[PDB]
Write a protein that binds this ligand. Structure first.
Ligand SMILES: NC(=O)n1cc(NC(=O)N2C[C@@H](N)C[C@H]2C(=O)Nc2cccc(OC(F)(F)F)c2)c2ccccc21
Length: 216
C-alpha cells in the first residue's frame, strides 16, 4: 500500500497474509470458515495462510498460521493475463473464529460500485518505490473510477499517489463493508494517476465462488 496508513490492529478481521517460505507473498480475504480468497498469480512450492495478524513478525495471541488442503485457481486463469485472477485456498482446518478473525461478506449482486465511492484496500504490500516492506498491516481509501475512465469483470480505483502495489495482490477492496474487488496480481506501475489500480470484481465470479465453497 502506497500513501496509506497503519491499520488499527485486528480491525479488519478478514485480512489474510498468504505466505510462501514463511514470508508474506500476497494478501487474502477470509470468505468462509475454511476458505481464503486471493489472486491467481500468488499460487504460481508450499502455501501457508496467516490469520489474525497485524504485525507479521511479533507475537499476538490471535495470530494463527494454517497450511492449505487445496488451492483452487480460477480454471480460466492464465499466467500471462490478469483475467479471472482469483484463487480459492482451503485451509487445513476451519479457522478458529473470533473478533480478530472473521469472514467478510462478498458482493453477489452483479452491479458496479457507484463511481466516486471511496473503498478500502488493505495489505502488507510495499509502501514506497524502493520496496520498503511494512511489518504491520497498512490501508488506504480509494475512489472507484467510472468504467469509461478505467478505459466488465474488472474495476478500477484512483492510483494518484495512493494505490495498491506489489504484495497487496489478492487483498480486499471493500465498499460499504462488503467485498467488491480483489487486487490483481500482475506487474504494474503503482501510484501513477494515468495508470489506475486494477481489481477483480468478485460479483462477476459469484457462481464459481459458491461452486468451490459447495464441493467442500
Ligand atoms: N496490483 C499490483 O499493482 N501489483 C500486483 C503484483 N503482483 C504481486 O505482488 N505478486 C504476484 C506474485 N509474484 C506474488 C506477488 C509478489 O510479487 N509478492 C511479493 C514478492 C516479494 C516480496 C513481497 O512482500 C512485500 F510485498 F514486499 F512485502 C511480496 C505487482 C508486482 C509489481 C508491481 C505491482 C504489482
Amino acid at each position: 500500500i502506497l500513501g496509506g496508513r497503519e491499520a488499527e490492529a485486528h480491525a479488519r478481521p478478514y485480512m489474510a497474509s498468504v505466505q510462501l517460505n514463511g514470508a508474506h507473498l500476497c494478501g487474502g480475504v477470509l470468505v468462509a470458515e475454511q476458505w481464503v480468497l486471493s489472486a491467481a498469480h500468488c499460487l504460481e512450492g508450499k502455501v501457508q495462510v496467516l490469520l489474525g495478524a497485524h504485525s507479521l513478525s511479533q507475537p499476538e495471541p490471535s495470530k494463527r498460521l494454517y497450511d492449505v488442503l487445496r488451492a483452487v485457481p480460477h480454471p480460466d486463469s492464465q499466467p500471462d493475463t490478469i483475467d479471472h485472477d482469483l484463487l480459492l485456498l482451503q485451509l487445513s482446518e476451519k479457522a478458529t473464529l473470533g473478533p480478530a478473525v472473521r469472514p467478510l461478506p462478498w458482493q453477489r449482486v452483479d452491479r458496479d460500485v457507484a463511481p466516486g465511492t471511496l473503498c478500502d484496500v488493505a495489505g502488507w504490500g510495499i509502501v514506497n518505490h524502493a520496496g520498503r516492506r511494512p511489518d504491520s498491516l497498512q490501508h488506504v481509501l480509494l475512489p472507484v473510477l467510472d468504467r469509461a475512465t478505467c478505459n466488465e469483470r474488472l474495476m478500477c480505483a484512483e492510483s494518484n499517489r495512493r494505490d495498491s502495489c506489489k504484495g497487496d495482490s489478492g487483498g480486499p477492496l471493500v465498499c460499504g463493508g462488503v467485498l467488491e474487488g480483489v487486487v490483481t496480481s500482475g506487474s504494474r506501475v503503482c501510484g501513477n494517476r494515468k495508470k489506475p489500480g486494477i481489481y477483480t470484481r468478485v460479483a462477476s465470479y459469484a457462481a464459481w465462488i459458491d461452486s468451490v465453497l459447495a464441493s467442500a
